[PDB]
Amino acid sequence: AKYELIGLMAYPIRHSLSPEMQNKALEKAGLPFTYMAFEVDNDSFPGAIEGLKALKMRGTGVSMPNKQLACEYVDELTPAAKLVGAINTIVNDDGYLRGYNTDGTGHIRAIKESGFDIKGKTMVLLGAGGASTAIGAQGAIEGLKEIKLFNRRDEFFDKALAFAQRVNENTDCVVTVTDLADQQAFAEALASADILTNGTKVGMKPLENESLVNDISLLHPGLLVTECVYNPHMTKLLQQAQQAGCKTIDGYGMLLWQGAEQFTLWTGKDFPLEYVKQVMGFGA
Amino acid sequence: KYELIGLMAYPIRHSLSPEMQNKALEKAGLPFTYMAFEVDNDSFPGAIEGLKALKMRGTGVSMPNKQLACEYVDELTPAAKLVGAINTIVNDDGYLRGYNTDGTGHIRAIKESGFDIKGKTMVLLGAGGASTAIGAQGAIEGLKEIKLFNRRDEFFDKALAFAQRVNENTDCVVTVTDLADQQAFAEALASADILTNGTKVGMKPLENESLVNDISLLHPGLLVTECVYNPHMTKLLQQAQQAGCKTIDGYGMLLWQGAEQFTLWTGKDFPLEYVKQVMGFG
Ligand SMILES: NC(=O)c1ccc[n+]([C@@H]2O[C@H](COP(=O)([O-])OP(=O)(O)OC[C@H]3O[C@@H](n4cnc5c(N)ncnc54)[C@H](O)[C@@H]3O)[C@@H](O)[C@H]2O)c1
Ligand SMILES: NC(=O)c1ccc[n+]([C@@H]2O[C@H](COP(=O)([O-])OP(=O)(O)OC[C@H]3O[C@@H](n4cnc5c(N)ncnc54)[C@H](O)[C@@H]3O)[C@@H](O)[C@H]2O)c1
Numbered sequence: 347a348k349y350e351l352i353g354l355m356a357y358p359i360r361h362s363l364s365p366e367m368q369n370k371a372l373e374k375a376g377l378p379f380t381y382m383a384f385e386v387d388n389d390s391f392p393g394a395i396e397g398l399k400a401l402k403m404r405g406t407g408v409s410m411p412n413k414q415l416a417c418e419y420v421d422e423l424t425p426a427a428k429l430v431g432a433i434n435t436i437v438n439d440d441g442y443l444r445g446y447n448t449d450g451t452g453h454i455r456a457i458k459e460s461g462f463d464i465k466g467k468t469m470v471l472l473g474a475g476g477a478s479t480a481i482g483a484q485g486a487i488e489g490l491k492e493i494k495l496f497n498r499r500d501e502f503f504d505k506a507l508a509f510a511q512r513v514n515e516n517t518d519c520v521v522t523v524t525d526l527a528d529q530q531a532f533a534e535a536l537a538s539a540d541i542l543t544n545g546t547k548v549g550m551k552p553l554e555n556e557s558l559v560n561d562i563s564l565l566h567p568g569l570l571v572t573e574c575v576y577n578p579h580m581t582k583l584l585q586q587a588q589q590a591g592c593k594t595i596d597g598y599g600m601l602l603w604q605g606a607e608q609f610t611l612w613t614g615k616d617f618p619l620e621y622v623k624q625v626m627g628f629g630a
Numbered sequence: 631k632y633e634l635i636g637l638m639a640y641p642i643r644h645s646l647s648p649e650m651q652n653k654a655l656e657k658a659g660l661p662f663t664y665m666a667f668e669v670d671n672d673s674f675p676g677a678i679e680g681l682k683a684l685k686m687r688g689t690g691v692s693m694p695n696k697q698l699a700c701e702y703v704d705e706l707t708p709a710a711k712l713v714g715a716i717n718t719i720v721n722d723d724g725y726l727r728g729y730n731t732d733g734t735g736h737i738r739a740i741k742e743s744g745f746d747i748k749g750k751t752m753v754l755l756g757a758g759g760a761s762t763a764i765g766a767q768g769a770i771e772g773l774k775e776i777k778l779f780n781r782r783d784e785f786f787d788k789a790l791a792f793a794q795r796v797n798e799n800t801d802c803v804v805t806v807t808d809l810a811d812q813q814a815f816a817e818a819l820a821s822a823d824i825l826t827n828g829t830k831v832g833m834k835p836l837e838n839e840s841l842v843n844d845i846s847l848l849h850p851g852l853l854v855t856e857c858v859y860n861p862h863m864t865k866l867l868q869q870a871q872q873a874g875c876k877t878i879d880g881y882g883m884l885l886w887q888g889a890e891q892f893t894l895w896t897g898k899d900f901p902l903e904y905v906k907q908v909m910g911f912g
Contacts, residue, residue: 347637347648347666353684360631382634382663390683397680400673401636 351401352612354383355394355416356409363626364407367605370625374618379404388415395419398438405437405612413476420445429483429512432476434604437611446611449477450484452604453572456595457541459603462570465489467540470532472496472558474506474523477574478545482509486519493519494535496558498526526558536564542571542587549573549581557583567591576601579628598628634684635664635895638677638699639692642666646909647690650888653908657901662687671698678702681721687895688720696730696759703728712766712795715759717887720894729894732760733767735887736855739878740824742886745853748772752824755779755809755841757789760857761828765792769802776804777818779811779841780829809841819847825854825870832856832864840866850874859884862911881911 354364368381386394391412398406408416413432417423420436420443427433433445457464469490471482474497482493493513497506503525510521524531536542542565548558559565571587576597587594606617623629637647651664669677674695681689691699696715700706703719703726710716716728740747752773754765757780765776776796780789786808793804807814819825825848831841842848854870859880863871870877889900906912 347642347645349665351634351665351667380663380665382632384634384684386683393679393683396676397684400669400676401638401667401680402669402673 349378349380350404352379352381352404353406355386355406355412357385357387359383359385367622371609371617371622374621375615377613391415403438408434426450426483426487430479435608447480448604448607450480451607453481453600454484454488456599456603466491468492468538469541469543470494470535470539472544473546474502474509479509481545486513486517490519493521495523496526533564542569544583545574549575549583550577554578559586562586562590565590573597632661632663633687635662635687636689637666638669638689638695640668640670642668650905654892654901654905657904658898660896674698686721691717709733709766709770713762718891730763731887731890732763734890736764736883737767737771738886739882749774750823751775752826753777753819753822754826756828757785762792769796769800773802776802779807779809779815781809816847823853827866828857832858832866833860837861842866845873848873856880
């Protein structure tokens with residue numbers, strides 16, 4: 347009876363790995379919090395937030411299709427989340443709601459944890475969806491000199507443009523958006539890049555048999571390559587990077603660090619990352 | 631995949647409901663989790679918004695929201711309408727049903743000892759949540775007469791009106807006597823099968839008293855029930871036991887009340903003997 351509730355507001359909720367990860371981390375540390383998932387869409391989201399406040403829930407993770415909508419229900423968003431226009435985390439600080447995007451802080455935390463310094467580097471970002479804008483937003487916020495966002499001409503292209511505009515106009519980070527079709531612009535981008543980051547669905551099943559990088563000669567050792575895809579754990583892009591001497595960061599790195607960021611936001615304590623890693627079976 | 635079952639009250643710190651329900655849930659491996667939420671009259675309406683939006687299976691309700699909660703359910707039981715307060719809400723696809731298991735619980739605890747409430751005469755001490763719950767249910771289930779005594783406080787008037795609702799909707803006879811009429815108390819008692827305390831007397835910081843100043847108001851063979859369960863053995867029960875007469879304690883009510891809630895939420899049978907032992911109610 348002394349535990350606070352932390353939710354997950356989304357629909358569907360069947361395939362989430364947050365519940366087990368947060369709860370196992372919580373048990374390990376013996377903290378007075380319980381994590382539960384709830385089926386919430388755009389129509390019930392407003393009443394769910396009223397519940398969050400009335401019941402004094404500690405917070406809630408947020409997923410499709412409520413991430414953009416949730417931005418309208420918090421009192422405060424971080425500068426990175428305002429760039430993104432979407433949050434996956436809400437923290438209830440005694441009635442005052444703070445909105446965060448731990449996908450961006452997590453991925454950026456995973457990078458730093460490897461001993462890589464973000465400040466002033468050049469990132470070649472593939473995609474402009476939820477993972478990519480969150481990643482680039484935080485990256486800009488933490489000092490990236492430039493971001494060479496490459497996105498095909500699909501339903502996300504204009505999104506890339508506004509994102510670049512927002513990041514450009516609100517940060518000292520220089521973002522350019524280039525059409526993926528221009529392979530030479532891509533070749534020059536990669537050569538000048540310190541980090542290659544895939545935030546697209548390419549690499550994830552069923553498309554598990556492809557990368558946005560046609561030839562490994564396009565990559566150069568010394569380049570750090572990060573992957574958002576965690577299914578499969580070993581993407582084609584990752585294998586290219588490992589077959590080119592590049593240092594790497596897999597999907598599990600972002601997933602675990604992202605979970606950590608949420609955990610600390612809600613508990614104030616450090617996340618037992620190695621433990622959660624083994625317990626969830628992300629080690630093999 | 632688990633559904634939430636809450637408790638909406640303030641305070642919540644002392645409630646034994648969370649442990650009982652979660653022990654019972656865990657014993658059967660049921661896909662539900664019970665959790666207490668600190669909620670009062672001002673946050674109750676938003677908390678109900680939350681029960682619907684989050685799709686909770688339901689929620690237990692305790693002070694100070696039992697009366698207010700009746701205005702937030704789509705449907706209430708006949709007993710609940712007589713009491714004017716509920717301790718239980720069940721959410722059936724957005725449709726909310728209110729029940730007062732405190733009534734059914736106490737009555738079930740009585741029937742369970744081997745005693746039949748039909749046609750009997752109960753001397754009912756009190757007019758709060760416990761007493762009106764018990765009286766409502768007891769009346770509905772064939773109680774011939776309810777003689778309730780209450781001091782001249784804020785619950786006296788509530789007692790009068792309560793009596794009226796019951797007297798008007800049941801075949802039960804209910805009277806309201808000033809607890810200060812020591813004579814009527816001994817007399818209206820004299821002819822009684824059941825003595826039931828629903829007041830706070832017996833519970834700390836009133837653990838040294840009883841509303842029974844004499845045993846000659848007790849015919850050892852009589853039935854004395856106590857709502858108080860802190861302490862387990864109240865002075866009113868300690869007298870009764872030494873008096874020789876048979877009694878039903880607060881634990882009986884607590885467990886049967888909890889059982890009803892559990893079955894309403896889960897559809898399963900409550901593991902009462904297990905919870906009893908685990909809770910150390912033995
Ligand atoms: N590791 C983690 O913690 C984590 C967290 C979030 C998302 N992800 C993963 O990251 C990936 C992206 O998810 P999201 O939510 O941002 O997706 P999203 O639907 O919001 O956007 C997908 C992006 O991929 C690009 N894309 C898709 N197919 C493409 C193709 N064939 N060629 C070129 N571009 C293509 C789109 O233009 C778009 O910019 C998914 O694999 C998801 O599983 C991982
Ligand atoms: N065992 C269970 O399941 C269960 C359930 C509910 C309540 N309870 C217990 O029942 C008792 C009553 O709780 P409630 O919710 O009905 O309280 P309540 O506030 O609603 O009503 C209190 C009643 O006690 C009377 N009273 C208070 N002090 C008195 C005094 N000094 N002398 C005479 N009468 C006095 C009042 O007039 C009133 O009628 C408490 O001990 C509570 O813990 C037990």
